[model samples]
Target: LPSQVKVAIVGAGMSGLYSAWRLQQEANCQDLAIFERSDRTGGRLDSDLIEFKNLRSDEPKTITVKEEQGGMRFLFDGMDDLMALFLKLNLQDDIVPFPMNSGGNNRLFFRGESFSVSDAQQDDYAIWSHLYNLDQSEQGVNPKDIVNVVFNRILEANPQFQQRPKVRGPQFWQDFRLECQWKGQGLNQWTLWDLYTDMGYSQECITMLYRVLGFNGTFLSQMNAGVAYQLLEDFPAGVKFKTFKDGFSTLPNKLVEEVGTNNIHLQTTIEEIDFNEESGLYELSYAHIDAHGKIHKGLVKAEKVILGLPRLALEKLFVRSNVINRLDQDRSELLWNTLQSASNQPLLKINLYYDSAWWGRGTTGRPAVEFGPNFADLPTGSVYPFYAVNEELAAALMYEERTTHPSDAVEAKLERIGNDKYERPAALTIYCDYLNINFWSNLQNIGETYHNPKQDHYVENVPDDIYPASTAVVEQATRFFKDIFNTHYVPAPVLTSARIWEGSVKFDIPANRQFGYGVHQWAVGANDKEVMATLSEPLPNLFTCGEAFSDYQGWVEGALRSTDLALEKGFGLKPLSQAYFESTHISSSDAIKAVYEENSSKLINQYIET
Candidate 1:
């Protein structure tokens, strides 16, 4: 490894890779290194390919499916930075429309009743109101509509935001968030729950919103009110979603290519970072495992250091290293307080592969099941039919309004006959977060065997090959599907895959303090912008950039935006394109605009038509 470099970037995730690419291409900084603790890059943009053997059939057949274990899709309209990068990387062809809702046919199982989401969208709120004790005004209002109305009321009262036409800039929203007020209080000072309660929303109505929106219970209530408001208001109507054809990891893998593999140090963990006052450089001490599993320790000095780690990772590093001690008492406190201003959200995803589309079978009087997310108040939380929301299959099934019934061909595809099924491969993904994650984590300790050989059921049934998860998780997932479908016989999965982002206690491995969180949410009453700014440059020549401290937290766009801020504030480097500048909407300065304006034509040409 090089003993010294112009810059050192810790973490080969989206933010770190993007920083290296931009610094190399835009600023002519070739003398830099990327250090990743993991064996591979794409930190949180993880996707896994599994080959499932259909054990139900006499002759086993294998089907390969790609499943996302981390951030999956991006907003097509407002996420300018990510779109621009896709265009630049020539990945536009791989982009496929992701249906946010499944033709309003998506099932919702709440309080022991199962109904389509469309039932709630009706003019009469009898279906939902009967289940919850809602206020008269909220009786007929859809959950999403209720939140939208509340957001509009706040915006309408503030002429500064309402009078101005919509600007697709992060800076515009950030400024408004910092300045806006509600009930004579700063918007940032109030939590979403606080704002909703203050606006006369009943607890039942809030609970209904939580159930319908499928947000983590804690995150929805504790999220900053202003950030929540800006997110809802910023997006246009019928907002489109998109994901890579191959997988989400393809984006970061492409970035790895752009940055050059030689520049990245894989299987290298930065244990500590020390500022050398005499040399005016940062010394990064790291441990790396070589190809033969030989451990090697080394130190690299750099004029500048960029930490693109997530909230949990940063906290772990601070506690494990002397970096915090290097700072002055006041600056150290500022840094520590800023880090504590946000919370990491744990997420768990379980994917099960079935031999056929059994869920689509129309039983007795009920029609075929729609391909979309299914929500439940159960521990499983949200379940999605992966095929119905991805690639060509999604395009064929989804309609413009997304509420229309499926065509004849679609019905035929879902048709079931006696002893014969649709005969197509199907996969279901279960998503749960926050406290629900603990439920699944607890199940991991149960025995790993799917079948007891002596039992009558086991005598007839043979266990299929499942990876990376216990039999308990798979059984729970199957039961969850059965419960949501209200069916007696849901087919056993041919294969199962699971990811617990918060790590597992069964193995005696501590929860992944590094890159364990699914997303970060700003805490109530925290000055998000101030925290971001302070953490961006916690010390001289040292910087931090990632989704945790960005306005678009929990998105790849946020990671890119934070990197843009780090480059601009630390190196005096300007954004590479108009899309980049618009990502953060950092400032309205004409000088910065002019720099991006030079590439305005390119931006126009790359504008995604979705």
Candidate 2:
């Protein structure tokens, strides 16, 4: 007997499940089926309750709660689409403020000294303050001054530029065209670095921004200033960051409640999808893996199929099934070709559980710190989990280095075995993020690496990924504060652990995109193909969503928006409510138009036609 559904959604991540929720609501059918490759939903929205003993003092030990493995923080402000769903799900009450320091309390450790963020307002001895005072400079201006000027334009409405055209446009496009001063050659023609230099900004100022901001700064420098202006300008400033009280994945997991658990299939891998020209349906072949390592194969048929998988995952599907070859048409060829340009970045996170927050005074008293170009800190930036701050468990950035010591020996030392006293050292996180890709590579070939066998399932599943031993990692991190700030807050760790996000983010420089951190590139080719597909059915019954097809490439909002697009454009269903429309929700009619207009032209070439 053939099992089939009206609409079949792929991937159970936030995007996939969100698509399922929308379909269940609009289609008024219970026949919808969702296929997920993982054992659970929430995709990258993962967290864990980590239990560890004090590395230094064994008396105090507890499992750290809500250890975020991915998608830790959620930004609400004007991003009401996701917020609307949150409200609908009654998750608003679960929202809480993230513990972050601002103003003078936020200190900048640069040039072997500490400078408060407010110091930038000082006229004397403040390196960056002078840039903000420069009233006018056509060229040869300080780079910091240029940053201030650009941000000022974004923070306040500029009289020099025209308001958004009355004609409807994609949000990104509307902002881009106006802010860049439509057809303004200088803005689009040069990189941000070029613009900064041309404006007389010193190399030192620009480099400082690059090192401190990590991928964002490097990305901005390589991109045209107009794009950067569009990306950064009008950015909702001072918005309170929010997260679920339960965990980051709580929103998605709660979504499963309404979508119905029975309707979704977990541990199911979509191996192939073939279009049945005669039936006008899509046939899907997949394998559902069971706990005992048994694979149960099944087939499903559907009139409409919405693919909410990542671009990389989709590429594998097309290649495995040879879908393009089967169609042998221009449209089929273009879909695969456009997807080839999709870029998926990689990211890493290392969380060290400690018996104490040795780096500073007990949890409430730790100083918030930032490193700059001078420091060249590899882990980019870090945050102290104020809630997790205690003599039992604390965390920070550390160097991800492999030691030559044996795993047993390192464990022995951390536990203080030789002293004849049974003791464990405080745990410490040595490093995090892709900035340490070199160390990551080194770790693959190191003496010993470490990862909890069963702590955060959201953490990397790759075995032997973390160095089994990295005791010196704590000392490396502590040296910075001791030498520069004349402070000694951290002590030797009793234990060690690490986690790598693996391919969570990409740092590649594909054509038509600059190098930086992102899930994947919203390539010019993909945009062209998406436009053409909307103009006609690229395939008889196949459609796609997820970050692969959204403007906000790596975000949950992108997933929600893309699903709305694929459904409406492909099946003529009711369009989704577009967020940020007249301060109220509106139909997807204009949202669709905005996307078409956003990439109407290749960003680098105004007059070029696909």
Candidate 3:
């Protein structure tokens, strides 16, 4: 690495890669370096292919399946930045609608009782309300209805909030969160649990709400009330979800190509960062591990630094850095307290490949149309069908028809059948978050030797070295699957891959205390706007941006938005297009009228017909 550069970004995830690409394109800044601690490029956008060989069959048969260990899909609406980036990257055609079950006959297990999602929506709400002892007024009310009622009460109680903005967006919600007050205190100071309890929701009713909404027990109670209300109020309706046909990693991989591998330094961990007052630059000290696992330390100086790390990673870096410690006590406390404005959301996902698509077949082996998520009260919080498998199988089956018929003739047919199919070698994803992440972590601590005895029947093809799920985890998962589906014929999983995004468990070393949080939630009493701005540039020339402190947390769009903010405020870089600028709400340093005046001539001839 060079002794100095204009900019240095820590982390090779979506935020880091996107920042580098944008800086290069907008400002023409090529003198930059991206450091990634892991060997891989994509941080949480990991997609891996696992091959399963049939041992029982007389013929040599194997099927490869793509599994997502991290983020899988994005909503079509309200994700302007991600959609714009997709179009810019020429990935528009790769987008495919992710099919979801709309409650019709989908099973849900709760409190030793099984019910379909449709049952919970009954007019009387007797099916679910009977399970929990609730108040007379709450008996016939649905949980979502209760939420809406309470939300309206808040708005009615605080008339000033209703007058703030008619158009709801990130800025509107952020301002409301900071300005709105509840019971003579800021709305940010109240937790979801506090709000619900104070609104006359009983403990049992709250428990029912958590289970019904598919939220983790701790998440419902601990999340900030303002944040929760923002999410609820800004919820998109009648919007479709889409994902990459190849995998979600395709986006990040394309970014790596755009940024170029030469600029990115993988397997390099930034240990400490210090500001050099004499040179007016920030010094980054990093350790790079070579192919043989040998360490090499190096230093690089940059006028500006960007950290695209999660909350846990930032905390770990702050603990080791002297820059924060060298500041005055009041300043140090402010910075430290700002860092704690968000709490880490731990998540664990286990993907399993069975011998057949058992869940998609009826009693007579006919294909079933229902394909949504199954929620349960068990440790396995929810289960979703590997929708990619269905998409791939449908595409393969339509190949011959598409080749014979005209494009338009087959296009309509393909759209109808493409997102619904059940083929051989089915895959299911078990999603666990919050406290349940600890359950899988404890099982994983048993070591890799705990293999299932039945796994010997299948031939394994390991192209990538991913952590195999322990026998206990797989067994419990299978048991839960059977319990939810209410069937004993669930086939044994021939292949299983598990990932725990707990940060500390990612590396092999024991002393590394880096906490890996899958997502982040705003802490109660934290100022969203102030925390975001403060953390973006905690110290002079030092910046941080990611989903951790973004308005749309736990999304790739959030990362992009945060990066856009950093680029605009710190580097004075404008977005590529006015469309992106308006959609993402980037506040340019120069006046909007001036920017339009500068580009007014070019805009006249830029229009093109479809």
Among these predictions, the greatest lDDT belongs to: 3
**Candidate 2 residue spans exceeding 4 A from truth:** 51-64, 107-145, 151-161, 164-200, 217-237, 296-298, 340-342, 359-377, 382-386, 389-438, 441-445, 451-487, 492-518, 521-538, 571-610
Name the better of 2 and 3 by TM-score.
3
lDDT of 1 at 65: 58
Error of 2 at 116 (Å): 5.0
Q: What is the lDDT of residue 362 in candidate 2?
A: 30
Decoy 2 TM-score against native: 0.68
Location of the lowest summed lDDT over 10 successive residues in candidate 1: 457-466
lDDT per model, in order? Answer: 0.70, 0.50, 0.71
Q: Candidate 3 clashing pairs?
A: 502-516, 503-516
The estimated TM-scores of all candidates read 0.84, 0.68, 0.85
Candidate 3 regions exceeding 4 Å error are 51-64, 163-168, 217-221, 232-235, 363-369, 388-420, 447-461, 505-515, 575-610
lDDT of 3 by residue, 446-477 (tens): 65534546654553565463567887877788
- Looking at candidate 2, the ten consecutive residues that score lowest on lDDT are 392-401
User: How well is each residue in 457-545 modelled by candidate 1, as lDDT tens digits?
Assistant: 21223232223457888778778777787666776666566667662224325213333677776777778778888877877788999
Output the TM-score of candidate 1. Answer: 0.84
Clashes of 3: 2
The parts of candidate 1 lying over 4 Å away from their true place are 52-63, 121-123, 163-169, 217-221, 230-236, 362-365, 388-422, 449-467, 503-515, 579-610
> For candidate 2, lDDT tens digit of each residue in 533-579?
54234565677777544555446666666666776776665434443
lDDT score of residue 407 within candidate 2: 58
